[PDB]
Structure 1
Amino acid sequence: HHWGYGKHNGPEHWHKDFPIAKGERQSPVDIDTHTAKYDPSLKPLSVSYDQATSLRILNNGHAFNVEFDDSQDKAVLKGGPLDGTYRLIQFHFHWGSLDGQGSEHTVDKKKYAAELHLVHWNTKYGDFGKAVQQPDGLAVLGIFLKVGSAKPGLQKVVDVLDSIKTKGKSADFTNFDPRGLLPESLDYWTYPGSLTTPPLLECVTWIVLKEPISVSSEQVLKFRKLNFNGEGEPEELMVDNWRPAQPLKNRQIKASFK
């Protein structure tokens, strides 16, 4: 067996193999907008994706990852709440079986249809595997998806999904520009948290954008045609691959905006 999002191995079971699941800085969380405090000391986010080099897309059995060449300082996240330079390694999404659920973070208990995670590692730790062992090792930029108008910059991702239907399939995926997945505004909330999948390491500075992007119903329907299973195994649609909100405990969520 293995962890997953099924009836028998979903989020409420993860603690049995990953006891940090019940830890002090777990993610995602509900963002209570009225209690989040505006912090005028927070800087604008600096997103520098002009030279980003995508390489490949992978169905890993839990989601799909669009992977980047992180061997040089290209595609970096700086500023905001962060000290230093964080390099983009991959992005992926979490989504629902229906448009009314799918996000990991919630906003005043509102669930979005999906949530995009742009994952970055702190260059002071040299590579990703070392960074996840540090409390300031990662910065994950989270972006909500709502269903409405299509996101033109998402379509190249949607169209390659047919070629990675099942667990363990990958496809070449070069020249994809992740700037096409951003909203207009970079206003954000931030808090200290964790990976949202096992091993659930408490190594993430979360930066969650206030403004969702709009994707079309047809775009998200194509996410829901993916499979958790491998080729030749009983079909299990890749849907509801989100962890619910976890206790905030002794944390403060800060807002970059009034």
Structure 2
Amino acid sequence: HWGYGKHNGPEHWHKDFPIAKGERQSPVDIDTHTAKYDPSLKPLSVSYDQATSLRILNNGHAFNVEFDDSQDKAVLKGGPLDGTYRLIQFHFHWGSLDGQGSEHTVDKKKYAAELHLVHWNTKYGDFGKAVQQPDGLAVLGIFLKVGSAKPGLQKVVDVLDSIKTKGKSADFTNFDPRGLLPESLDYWTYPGSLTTPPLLECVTWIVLKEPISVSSEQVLKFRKLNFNGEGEPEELMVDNWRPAQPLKNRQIKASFK
């Protein structure tokens, strides 16, 4: 099945998922000089005060922090979006080294990691229906650079020993995702896709310009996770990023000058 190895990685995915070669695939390189300011965009509205985290799961590709998405508790609105999008999970992509790991790039620069906060459009009732729609999802992408620790990330890092291998989950209640956001909500936006199979072209991407800082020690913990299940040969969960895809007939818009 698909993964991030030599025989199963991103250049292979098209064989099982031909949309991998589609018209609106993600991630992309954000060419900052060609993005255009769009004064009609709004500020984004990130309303996470009522968020209810439930569980953290090693799914063999990443770890997901899952939320209760059965009511409007943690929602994204505004910006480029029409309507209300509910937070379902967040996860990361990261590298084996600090010079790689992000999926989006900025002027070809790769960050150490990238956080995806995944939200679905409430007009479609559930996640599985939303991914079948061109405006089904909104993903807030946040770059990670290595420097000072991110205090709000530590409780995530804390629990990773308990979900080392694929298929392991742990209770993860009362986690506040506000502690993972940078100071500024300035962003770029464009229409794209899931960055993992099934690669569906259902995402409005909102990529924040300001990275968060995490410490070496925090990233190093990410890199101790395993892609394998328990009692299988150990293969470190690193370099779980898809590279930039062709922009094709898209314009990236900026919320800022």
CA distance in 1, matches of 2:24, 2:10: 16
Shift of 1:136: 0.1
- For 1:1-258, list aligned pairs within 5 A: 2-258=1-257
Deviations 1:139-176 (A, max 9, x none): 00000000000000000000000000000000000000
Aligned counterparts of 1:29 and 1:49: Cα–Cα separation in 2 = 27
Q: Structure 1: which 5+ runs fail to align?
A: none
* Aligned-residue RMSD, C-alpha: 0.2
1:7, distance to aligned residue in structure 2 (A): 1.2
Deviations 1:76-117 (A, max 9, x none): 000000000000000000000000000000000000000000
Mind listing any 5+ residue stretches in structure 2 that lack a counterpart?
Answer: none
Name the CA distance, whole Å, in 1 between partners of 2:7 and 2:194: 21
Aligned equivalents of 1:156, 1:247: Cα separation in 2:
36
Count of paired positions = 257
Q: Distance in 1 between matches of 2:150 and 2:72?
A: 28
Cα-to-partner distance string for 1:215-238 (whole Å, 9 max, x where unaligned) = 000000000000000000000000
TM-score (norm 2): 1.00
Return the alpha-carbon distance in structure 2 between the equivalents of residues 201 and 236 of structure 1: 27
- C-alpha displacement of 1:5: 0.2
Moved over 3 A (4+): none
SS of alignment partner, residue 5 of structure 2: coil
Aligned mates of 1:16, 1:7 — CA distance in 2:
14
Distance 1:55 1:6 in 2: 31
- d(CA) in 2 for partners of 1:73 and 1:46? 13
Q: What whole-Å deviation, never above 9, does each CA across 1:48-81 have from its counterpart, x for those lacking one?
A: 0000000000000000000000001100000000
Aligned mates of 1:64, 1:78 — CA distance in 2: 25
Question: Helix, strand or coil for the counterpart of 1:153?
Answer: helix
Distance across 2 between alignment mates of 1:38 and 1:243: 27
State the alpha-carbon separation in 2 of the partners of residues 70 and 201 from structure 1.
Answer: 20
Distance 2:223 2:7 in 1: 20
1:207 CA drift (Å): 0.1
C-alpha displacement of 1:246: 0.1
Task: Give the Cα separation in 2 of the matches to 1:16 and 1:79.
Answer: 37
Aligned equivalents of 1:63 and 1:90: distance in 2?
Answer: 12
